[PDB]
């Protein structure tokens, strides 16, 4: 037999740190559907809803945005922002974000008029194909930078919490390694960032022990 199915024409997701589009609902997903993912917080909780197949947020269609105000980082630095995308039978997309630490929640109903039209959808698919390698390289460097940035700031935090408990020779080694990582993060060499991350870890075993205590 033959039939008409209702599926999403393009991936749907949110902007994440570094200007990346992170997908919540894959392209060509059957509706109604419902997907959620928990995110770590990195400053202001802004939920910027995106439609498209590109890895750069700026290259996708903005469907709307909202803030989740007055949120404090969860204990032990655990991921706390639960984002839910729900598409009903009528094809209406609803996006919500909840702070699992306070219970604070905000939601938006996306307007159909915010989405790309048929011709724009075809162009989007073509543009994603034509720039697949560049998009991958972009995302991979952002991912690596976000990892290294997190290690950089986390380690600096542990150094302060350790205080005089951290021996002078360890402190000197860690400080030098932090500077090397910071420098690598400003560059575009992913392997160099990974190397400097590992070198910092290697001089952090006493730091790890103190934090564990």
From Swiss-Prot:
Effect listed in the UniProt record for changing residue 77 to D: In dnaK756(TS); confers temperature sensitivity
Compartments (UniProt record): Cytoplasm; Cell inner membrane
Function: Plays an essential role in the initiation of phage lambda DNA replication, where it acts in an ATP-dependent fashion with the DnaJ protein to release lambda O and P proteins from the preprimosomal complex. DnaK is also involved in chromosomal DNA replication, possibly through an analogous interaction with the DnaA protein. Also participates actively in the response to hyperosmotic shock.
Phenotype reported upon loss of the gene: Non-essential; synthetic lethality is seen in a triple tig-dnaK-dnaJ disruption, although this depends on temperature (triple disruptions grow slowly at 20 and 34 degrees Celsius but not at all at 43 degrees) and strain background.
Top-level taxonomy: Bacteria, Pseudomonadati, Pseudomonadota, Gammaproteobacteria, Enterobacterales
Effect seen on changing residue 64 to D: In dnaK756(TS); confers temperature sensitivity
Family the UniProt entry places it in: Belongs to the heat shock protein 70 family.
Name of the protein in question: Chaperone protein DnaK
In-chain residues carrying the UniProt-annotated modification N6-succinyllysine: 111, 137, 196
Protein modification: Autophosphorylated; GrpE inhibits the autophosphorylation. Can be UMPylated on a tyrosine residue by SelO/YdiU, probably under stress conditions.
Known partners and oligomeric status: In pull-down experiments interacts with CedA.
N6-acetyllysine: residues carrying this PTM: 34, 165
